[PDB]
Amino acid sequence: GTRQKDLRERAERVIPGGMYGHESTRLLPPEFPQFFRRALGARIWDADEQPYIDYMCAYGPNLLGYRQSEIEAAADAQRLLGDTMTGPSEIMVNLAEAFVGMVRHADWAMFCKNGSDATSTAMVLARAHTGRKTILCAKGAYHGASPWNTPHTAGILASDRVHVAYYTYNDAQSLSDAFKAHDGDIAAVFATPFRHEVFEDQALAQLEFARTARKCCDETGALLVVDDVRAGFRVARDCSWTHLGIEPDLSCWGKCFANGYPISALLGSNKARDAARDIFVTGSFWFSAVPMAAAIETLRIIRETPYLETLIASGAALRAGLEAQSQRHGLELKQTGPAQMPQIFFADDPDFRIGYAWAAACLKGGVYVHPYHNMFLSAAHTVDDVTETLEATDRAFSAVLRDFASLQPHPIL
């Protein structure tokens, strides 16, 4: 990787550590490229023009395929009109109508940039609404990288999160107890719609857990907040708890509802409308029309096409394939969570040395898979993509067995 190497030398001079945040390759095998040149459909190309079938989907945003022609057409049409203007475009009204119409629990929407903006807004809203302090979150749940919730706490004060308290995800007793430990002071419960965290097996939400969240919120006046930034529109065409029959008061959305254009949302029921008006949240870029035009067209496609069934079928095929290959090579997998947003670990691999080696070996076959973070399917992944993926993964299992003696854990990890 001549170009990659040049880019990494230069990057370290002018970017702290060469790169930062969730897309940094600091904790990945060294074979993983940091910098890319182009993307299309379900593929990315690194700086040295090596293609990869992309199972990160840009860490969520690529729902329908990179440079999907209908969304790029809608964005083009709005770009001729205006983007970041002295006021929002009229199409802000159309977007809020569309999004509110699709989400059964919601009567209103607010638009922002980052998913962290929507979760932070939900936190402040809930405190305004209830006049209480305590925000309940699941231990280890990722809701953004603000001082109140960032998972690494360099430069974070105890005071930044003194009124955040924790429960065990999928543990109805734990959540009940959390309500009583801060009796009378719960502003909100935040829940992701399933367990989707790094270095950990995924798990679907348990019905009893979700019901208890809704019932405790009901009995106390606390707001139920579903954080759908990650799973939104890959579980359902509505809030990801729709199939449990549990409606939140607020839901947070982002990543993929404009297929890569930067826009996030807070959706809320009429119960929370007054508090939403009382709080002050804004940003320079929150009223920009082009991301809103992309979102309108993405949401239309979500409503009008079998995008969801398509990307689930691709996910299921990959999962079945990997199960068969794992048995054949005698290397047991743990494929957890929904097949369309899979976590694919090795059984009995506590320092991840097997998973790391397998993921790196998949790069050589032109497949990008991730050894510690959940993956994603797009509606642009084809049957041929899955077939070619499985040829790469087959070779990767062989390469891991061939080298098995010499496998090492990642130093930094």
Ligand X SMILES: *Cc1c(COP(=O)(O)O)cnc(C)c1O
Count CB atoms within 10 A of the CB of residue 403.
12
Q: Of the ranges 20-28, 237-245, 323-331, 378-386, which one interacts with its own copies (CB under 8 A)? A: 20-28
Residue 119 engages ligand X in binding (rule: CB under 6 A): yes
Among 1, 140, 163, 211, binds its own copies (CB under 8 A): 163
167 contact, one of Mg ion, its own copies, ligand X, none, CB 5-8 Å limit per kind: none
Among 115, 337, 342, 371, binds its own copies (CB under 8 A): 115
Question: Could you give the CA distance from residue 113 to residue 126 in angstroms, rounded to a whole number?
Answer: 20
Q: What is the DSSP letter of 97?
A: H
Find where tokens 């990494």 sit: 8
Please, which residue, 132 or 195, has the CB nearer to ligand X?
Answer: 195
CB-CB contact of 176 with 164 (8 Å): no
Please, which residue, 314 or 378, has the CB nearer to its own copies?
Answer: 378
Question: Could you give the CA distance from residue 370 to residue 54 in angstroms, rounded to a whole number?
Answer: 10
Residue 144 engages ligand X in binding (rule: CB under 6 A): yes
x/- binding map, residues 368-397, to its own copies, per CB under 8 A?
A: x-----------------------------
Q: Of the ranges 65-73, 357-365, 381-389, 390-398, which one interacts with its own copies (CB under 8 A)? A: 65-73
Secondary structure element (H or E) that encloses residue 328, with its range:
helix 307-329
157 contact, one of its own copies, Mg ion, ligand X, none, CB 5-8 Å limit per kind: its own copies
146 contact, one of ligand X, its own copies, Mg ion, none, CB 5-8 Å limit per kind: its own copies
Residue 299 engages Mg ion in binding (rule: CB under 5 A): no
Which residues, numbered 103-142, are part of the site for Mg ion (CB under 5 A)? 103, 106
**Phi, psi (deg, nearest 5) at residue 256:** -115, 0
Residue 227 engages ligand X in binding (rule: CB under 6 A): yes
Give the closest residue to 167 by CA, choosing from 199, 192, 198.
192
Secondary structure element (H or E) that encloses residue 203, with its range:
strand 203-204
Count CB atoms within 10 A of the CB of residue 13.
7
Tell me which residue has its CB nearest to Mg ion: 106
Among 31, 50, 51, 72, binds its own copies (CB under 8 A): 72
Looking at the DSSP bridge assignments, the partners of residue 333 are 346
CB of 347 to its own copies, least distance (A): 26
Residue 234 engages ligand X in binding (rule: CB under 6 A): no
Which residues, numbered 174-193, are part of the site for ligand X (CB under 6 A)? 192
Residue 137: partners with Cβ closer than 8 Å, 6 or more residues away: 143, 149, 164, 165, 166, 167, 190
Residue 283 engages ligand X in binding (rule: CB under 6 A): yes
192 contact, one of ligand X, Mg ion, its own copies, none, CB 5-8 Å limit per kind: ligand X
128 contact, one of Mg ion, its own copies, ligand X, none, CB 5-8 Å limit per kind: its own copies
Residue 370 engages ligand X in binding (rule: CB under 6 A): no
The CA–CA distances, whole Å, from 17 to 9, 10, 26, 153, 192 equal 10, 11, 9, 18, 31
**Phi, psi (deg, nearest 5) at residue 268:** -145, 150
Strands (E), 283-388: 333-336, 343-346, 367-368
Q: What is the DSSP letter of 16?
A: G
Judged by CB under 8 A, how many residues of this single chain contact its own copies?
Answer: 112
Q: Token pair for residue 17?
A: 């550590």
Please, which residue, 98 or 175, has the CB nearer to its own copies?
Answer: 98
**Residues forming the site for ligand X (CB under 6 A):** 114-116, 119, 142-144, 192, 227, 229-230, 254, 282-285
